[PDB]
């Protein structure tokens, strides 16, 4: 089982209509597998998007005398549903490294701690993201009575999108939280496979550099993550890395050489360790002075070549409503990364690579 997949993070909290739209789109571009958020954190998230996951510690779901507002966990048993009719997988990420829907820092807030990586070193927060997450794997989904932890339309469960942890650039702060989360996970639920979600940084590794001198803390250990040590880990399936030159200091002219070493040192690190890997988001802003879809094809046909099992775009989205519909009734580029089932050369790749995985 090899792939083309894609990411959509609003797949637990907008309409069946819109829902449908990414789902239908996925099945019809041959994309099999979709990358979503399971988590919905704090109070004025939940408010903001009128969806509530975990308003507040304890609290799953809609809070008791809230009224009219929708439940994240019957959103998410909406897309889960209409995943499996149409025959799409589903990696669900439990928790956020970013500010976006709550994340780390808003389970720092809770507890009164004061730097995001209080999160992975707390024992009251690592507690409540150990209930969160089993309230989610033991949920009952209201559209197929079949619980997440039994549900084959969901292919793993991720840890954490993006994680990094700053204040310890040993990378051993991770390595202990991904250990006891990953294990805990498998605890609750031995179906399903189980993968970090971050970026896939580097700790220093002999013979791995960077292309053209760039984006050098991506592999010297800034981040705090050690990925080689983390897909070491005996309740980690497999490794996800991430790919945006332009977030990261990459020049334009060098945005294709530096992504394709990326695919490329990844696979072969996660080869010898002999596990699979996802290279789970990339993106080029659409406004880069350089082909996009040229570049894509460039990096699909790496992780083809090379082995790698699956290599997923961020991001896809399709119709759009209200306060969240662009010029021709889409949901709107925010990022510069948005595809749609359209005409456009990105849309053309996408589909002839979905025949060849
Ligand atoms: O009563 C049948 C059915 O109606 C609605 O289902 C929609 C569904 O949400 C769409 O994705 C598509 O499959 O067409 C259906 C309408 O024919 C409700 O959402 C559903 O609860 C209900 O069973
Ligand atoms: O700070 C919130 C901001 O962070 C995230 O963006 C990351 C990005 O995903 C990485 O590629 C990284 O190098 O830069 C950003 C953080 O500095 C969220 O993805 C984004 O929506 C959000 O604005
Ligand atoms: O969540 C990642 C996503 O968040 C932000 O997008 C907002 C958008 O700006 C709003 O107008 C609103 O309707 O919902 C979106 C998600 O909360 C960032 O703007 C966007 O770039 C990013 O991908």
Not at 51 to 71: K, L, R
Not at 233 to 245: A, M, N, R, S, W
Not at 285 to 308: C, E, M, Q
Not at 309 to 336: C, K, N, Q, V
Request: glycine share 10%; net charge negative.
């Amino acid at each position: 089982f090899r792939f083309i997949g894609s990411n959509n993070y609003y797949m637990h909290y907008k309409s069946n209509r819109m829902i449908d739209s990414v789902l239908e789109s996925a099945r019809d571009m041959g994309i099999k597998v979709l990358r979503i958020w399971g988590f919905l954190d704090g109070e004025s998230y939940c408010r903001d998007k009128n969806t509530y996951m975990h308003p507040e510690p304890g609290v799953f779901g809609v809070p008791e005398g809230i009224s009219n507002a929708q439940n994240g966990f019957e959103r998410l048993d909406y897309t889960i549903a209409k995943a499996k009719e149409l025959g799409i997988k589903l990696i669900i990420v439990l928790v956020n490294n970013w500010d976006d829907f709550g994340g780390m820092n808003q389970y720092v807030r809770w507890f009164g701690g004061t730097h995001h990586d209080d999160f992975y070193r707390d024992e009251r927060i690592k507690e409540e993201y150990k209930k969160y997450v089993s309230f989610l794997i033991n949920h009952v989904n209201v559209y197929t009575g079949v619980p997440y932890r039994e549900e084959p339309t969901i292919m793993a469960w991720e840890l954490a999108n993006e994680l990094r942890c700053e204040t310890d650039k040993s990378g051993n702060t991770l390595v202990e939280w991904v250990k006891e989360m990953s294990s805990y996970i498998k605890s609750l639920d031995p179906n399903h496979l189980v993968a970090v979600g971050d970026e896939g940084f580097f700790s220093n590794y002999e013979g791995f550099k960077p292309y053209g001198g760039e984006a050098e803390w991506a592999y010297n250990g800034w981040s705090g993550v050690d990925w080689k040590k983390l897909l070491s880990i005996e309740t980690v399936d497999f490794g996800t890395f991430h790919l945006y030159p332009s977030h990261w200091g990459v020049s334009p002219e060098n945005y294709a050489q530096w992504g394709a070493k990326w695919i490329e040192d990844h696979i072969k690190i996660a080869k010898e360790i002999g596990k699979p890997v996802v290279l789970e988001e990339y993106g080029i802003p659409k406004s880069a002075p350089v082909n996009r879809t040229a570049i894509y094809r460039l990096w699909n046909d790496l992780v083809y070549d090379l082995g790698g099992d699956g290599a997923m775009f961020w991001m896809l989205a399709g119709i759009g409503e209200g306060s969240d519909r662009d010029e021709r009734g889409y949901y709107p580029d925010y990022d510069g990364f948005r595809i749609v089932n359209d005409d456009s050369p990105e849309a053309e790749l996408i589909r002839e690579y979905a025949k060849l995985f």
